[PDB]
Design a protein around this ligand. Structure first.
Ligand SMILES: NC(=O)C1=CN([C@@H]2O[C@H](COP(=O)(O)OP(=O)(O)OC[C@H]3O[C@@H](n4cnc5c(N)ncnc54)[C@H](OP(=O)(O)O)[C@@H]3O)[C@@H](O)[C@H]2O)C=CC1
Ligand SMILES: NC(=O)C1=CN([C@@H]2O[C@H](COP(=O)(O)OP(=O)(O)OC[C@H]3O[C@@H](n4cnc5c(N)ncnc54)[C@H](OP(=O)(O)O)[C@@H]3O)[C@@H](O)[C@H]2O)C=CC1
Ligand SMILES: Nc1nc(N)c(-c2cccc(Cl)c2)c(CCOCCCOc2ccccc2)n1
Ligand SMILES: Nc1nc(N)c(-c2cccc(Cl)c2)c(CCOCCCOc2ccccc2)n1
Ligand SMILES: O=c1ccn([C@H]2C[C@H](O)[C@@H](COP(=O)(O)O)O2)c(=O)[nH]1
Ligand SMILES: O=c1ccn([C@H]2C[C@H](O)[C@@H](COP(=O)(O)O)O2)c(=O)[nH]1
Lengths: 562, 559
């Protein structure tokens, strides 16, 4: 008996087509992935002809160009009550060693024909569409795995993939214990013989989430969901002698560490995903790692943290934007705060006036007084972050003072050094000015950043942060400095490659631990795409406006349950 | 047939004993390690009573204090011509479940008794010493593995482990390099059946090198050597299967590049690579395999990655790297020179620390449009910024007391009073001072951290890392700085974290580095602070308040 799997791409609302075509621009990587999955004999996965089978509906077959159909190097089966096997044979001259397309009257007919006639010849069976066969395959229960290309943008659609148990991996289920009726979806039988019995209910669990890809302005990733029971109870290698000699020394060296692992319940972000390729697993694993292995300490605010020292993460910028999906990020704040920085502004009331209240609780007359700055007007963060970037070291009077040409303009120097001499190893910008710390409302958190260019005009950025609030700050800081890297790269004719986050005191507050364990049950969605708008207008880092971006296809999980 | 292994601890001169006792103070982890290894049955390592045998010569039996004798929970066999099984039994009669201590006329005798009379009970046979039994074991050829605790210091000894093919893992090999070995080294048969034939020659090769431990002021590490022939020298099935064709095409690119690159790898035979120097060795390899070649300011040609890290433990041993000697002197004097606020490179050079000299020469300062710098004047660089951040620089003779931000004083004061602060930083990266400086700083920031156990940790961030030449020194500098700060804050040093920006090797050093990568690392030395009672503030340290105990690095590269 032969494996059956579903291969599909769908928008977050399960859209799969419109007017008998695909709803989106051509996803190149997806087409390559589709071919590599459907053409791969199972022997070659881990490094007398045997081939795979793709089964499609009539319309799906009719949606293809004659030159592409039948799909090369795979036995094509078409479920149609009207298509004739001989018409299809007559469409084009038959290639050598290509199978003869078959036409069957139902999915059960096709699977049967493959099992009996093609027993020695076919290895794997793929259902490649459309919604008819998808529903057929899901209700029949035959699909062990679903290869789902998650397309992060919505498009107009007339054809949708059936709702199914496991489809919350696509977007937020408003049935967060607040359902109207039980969420409607095909019944997936776990044991296909045993039909729609109450005990025989299956769900699809993700085992595999890739990093985000993109083509033609469409971000997407690949997941593999595996049929499990809907149990809902929660509701290197070496020689055998080389390994056995080492083992007693690895055994006692790990005694102190094995003991503490069984004394506590190791946290783990969505443990069932074996291949954790989505880049957000760095963030989720860091959260787990601080709860698991950090040390509970006291801190400035009184709340109390668990902390690690010296942690890192890297995010790709060549295909999507690392705007974290397991809890929505205040994008408007990231953008207005960063444009503010670039301006050299220290007046937080310019932010507070735009809805970005993040600096407010630190520019109060009370707090400015707690810092022995009774001379500071409310909203005057002092000579802080963006002051230090555009005027390092300059004397500070107040936020209304114009500071043009005072101090060192590191951002101008980084951009100039990248335009002219990108192999330089001194392209730094710091806000950590210790002669200025006491003039500041807040000593800067993200305090250093460095730029690099490889042999292919690809720009990377490191940023060092002494204090990282993983629960609330880190995702903002990741977006803040990723966005900076997009902006710098654009005004420098570089392509953006990677943001690297270097972290000092890295902590979670003990009042967030319970909510963060909740977050760690969330599987990340594909990353969005951040597009610079009006690129031809924007020639210098100061030309960017808050209206010059667009966060396309951002599909984050919602609010925490606590 | 039952596996035979050797367990031993030895100084780099192969010394194992003096006056029929151990040559060193008590090594607790070695004791822990020896007991876990000789007592672990393979049931509990790969995760009717079954026990291993330890086999020892007569004097090793007599060297054990009677409280430890016989070794508990293991069959004890003593190879002796005088000792009698009777007498041994009458010395401390055996507990229930312990084994009668056996006595045998020879290691062949002992090993037959184990294979014939303990064929159902004995799992592993360990030969535990001393010199007489070790030599027999090596020459018989029965030992598949050697478990050697490499004690990093030499202590006086009157008994030594036999010279053996593979003893290069202990120290350098010049004074008796290769032609002294046939007369000194035991011949180790590969197949013990075929004995001492020309094509039956074996060697012992490192498969396992642990991180460096210490006790009672003795640094040491654990290795396992395997017998090899001398002639090699000059999730669920459905889950995994479902996933695999997807990994197959995502790995398409990186497999095809991999199969073209012939991959540098440090000492690839070592499978467990616990020694912390492997991060450095690996990093060098990662850069040569995967970095990008461009040229640089001088046109020399550099291979670079961007954003690398390493971490080193300061609690048992000091990361003075062993695959190439580190200029400890320069590390210690430059760091004190930093702590002084001193910017006069001549004060180092007159101490034989010549590292700054090429960057303070009249010609070089002129290349920085600093024709007004007196020769030796690094400008308001590293130490000036640590102790006078933002101060206005005159020259290296000026007394800047009370000017600028004394970052180092604030760090210590914060560690002594509010150690859970998260602003305890110190930077030399002053962009307003950069042009006043001979060299824009390399290690430009460092941050400190205390856990709940009085343990200090330091992160240093470095924009530009010459992995070949600069980096091991930089590791030493900031690790030693963490020892000094820890001591004057009544803290214990835990860890030095190295955050690297542009990280590179020059293309001319690549051939020499392939050679260096052929060397197994040695155990780290201990660095000690003497006169701790006399040292109360970070300025009180002097060059004489330090000692480096146990540093046995490889010698110079031929390439
Ligand atoms: N994004 C993706 O991954 C994919 C997208 N698509 C898109 O989806 C749409 C096509 O899906 P759809 O519109 O549902 O048409 P289908 O591809 O499902 O083919 C529909 C026809 O196939 C036959 N058929 C389908 N289901 C059954 C069944 N259960 N039993 C018997 N015969 C069956 C019938 O042919 P007859 O009436 O002749 O009996 C039916 O009218 C197109 O827009 C296409 O582009 C298609 C495939 C994959
Ligand atoms: N650092 C370490 O790991 C270890 C260190 N040591 C140190 O080593 C020293 C003891 O070793 P050593 O001094 O060599 O004495 P041994 O422990 O080697 O035993 C020597 C005696 O054992 C018997 N013997 C040894 N080899 C043979 C043989 N091939 N055939 C038959 N009988 C044999 C003889 O006993 P008889 O004369 O009765 O026949 C010989 O006199 C001590 O200083 C001890 O502390 C010991 C063990 C391990
Ligand atoms: N992840 C994924 N799953 C899928 N089921 C398809 C798919 C979509 C429409 C028709 C068919 Cl047969 C397959 C794709 C899109 C890539 O399909 C490549 C094979 C089909 O090739 C063509 C070529 C032209 C028009 C329609 C399909 N990606
Ligand atoms: N890596 C290693 N290898 C070894 N062969 C020994 C060893 C040394 C002397 C005698 C014996 Cl039987 C074993 C040790 C030292 C720890 O051995 C613990 C067992 C013997 O316990 C004592 C205690 C005090 C003096 C002598 C042996 N470490
Ligand atoms: O950009 C920022 C700014 C602040 N924080 C968090 C980290 C700490 O929880 C707190 C900073 O306070 P101190 O590090 O000064 O104690 O705010 C961030 O994560 N990112
Ligand atoms: O403390 C130091 C000082 C210098 N370098 C090396 C790294 C670079 O190869 C070179 C510095 O040159 P630039 O970073 O200025 O280009 O010296 C170090 O590794 N550590």
């Amino acid at each position: 008996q032969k494996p059956v799997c579903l291969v599909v791409a769908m928008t977050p609302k399960r859209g799969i087509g419109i007017n008998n075509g695909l709803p989106w621009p051509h996803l190149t990587t997806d087409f390559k992935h589709f071919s590599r999955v459907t053409k791969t004999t199972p022997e070659e996965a881990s490094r007398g002809k045997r081939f795979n089978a793709v089964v499609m509906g009539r319309k799906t077959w009719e949606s293809m160009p004659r030159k592409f159909r039948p799909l090369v190097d795979r036995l094509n089966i078409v479920v149609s009550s009207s298509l004739k096997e001989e018409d299809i044979a007559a469409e084009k001259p038959q290639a050598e060693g290509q199978q003869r397309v078959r036409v069957c009257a139902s999915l059960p007919a096709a699977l049967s024909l493959l099992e009996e006639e093609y027993k020695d010849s076919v290895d794997q069976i793929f259902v490649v569409g459309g919604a008819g066969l998808y529903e057929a395959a899901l209700s029949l229960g035959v699909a062990s795995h679903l290869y789902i290309t998650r397309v992060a943008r919505e498009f107009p659609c007339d054809v949708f993939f059936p709702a199914f148990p496991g489809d919350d991996i696509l977007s937020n289920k408003s049935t967060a214990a607040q359902a109207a009726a039980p969420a409607e979806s095909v019944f997936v039988p776990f044991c296909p013989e045993l039909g729609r019995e109450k005990d025989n209910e299956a769900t699809y669990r993700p085992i595999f989430i890739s990093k985000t890809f993109s083509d033609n302005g469409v971000p997407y990733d690949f997941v593999v969901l595996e049929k499990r029971r809907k149990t809902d109870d929660a509701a290197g290698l070496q020689a055998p002698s080389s390994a056995a000699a080492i083992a007693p020394v690895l055994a006692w060296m790990d005694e102190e560490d094995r003991k503490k692992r069984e004394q506590k319940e190791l946290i783990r972000a969505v443990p069932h995903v074996h291949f954790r390729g989505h880049e957000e697993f760095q963030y989720l694993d860091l959260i787990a790692d601080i709860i698991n292995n950090g040390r509970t300490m006291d801190d400035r605010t009184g709340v109390g943290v668990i902390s690690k020292f010296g942690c890192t993460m890297r995010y790709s910028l060549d295909q999507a934007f690392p705007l974290l999906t397991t809890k929505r990020v205040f994008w408007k704040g990231v953008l207005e705060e960063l444009l503010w920085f670039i301006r050299g502004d220290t007046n937080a009331n310019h932010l507070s006036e735009k809805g970005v209240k993040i600096w407010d609780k630190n520019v109060t007359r009370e707090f400015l007084d707690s810092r022995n700055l009774p001379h500071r007007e409310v909203g005057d963060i002092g000579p802080g972050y963006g002051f230090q970037w555009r005027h390092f070291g300059a004397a500070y009077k107040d936020m209304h003072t114009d500071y043009t040409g005072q101090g060192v303009d590191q951002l101008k120097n980084v951009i100039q050094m990248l335009r002219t001499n990108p192999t330089d190893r001194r392209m730094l910008m710091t806000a950590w000015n210790p002669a200025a710390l006491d003039e500041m409302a807040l000593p800067p958190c993200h305090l250093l950043c460095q730029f690099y260019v490889n042999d292919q005009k690809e720009l990377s950025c490191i940023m060092y942060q002494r204090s990282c609030d993983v629960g609330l700050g880190v995702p903002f800081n990741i977006a803040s400095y990723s966005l900076l890297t997009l902006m710098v790269a654009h005004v420098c004719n570089l392509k953006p490659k990677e943001f690297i986050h270097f972290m000092g005191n890295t902590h979670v507050y003990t009042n967030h631990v319970e909510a963060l364990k909740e977050q760690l049950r969330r599987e990340p969605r594909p990353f969005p795409i951040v597009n610079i708008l009006n690129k031809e207008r924007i020639k210098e880092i100061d030309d960017f406006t808050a209206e010059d971006f667009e966060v396309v296809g951002y599909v984050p999980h919602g609010r925490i349950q606590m």
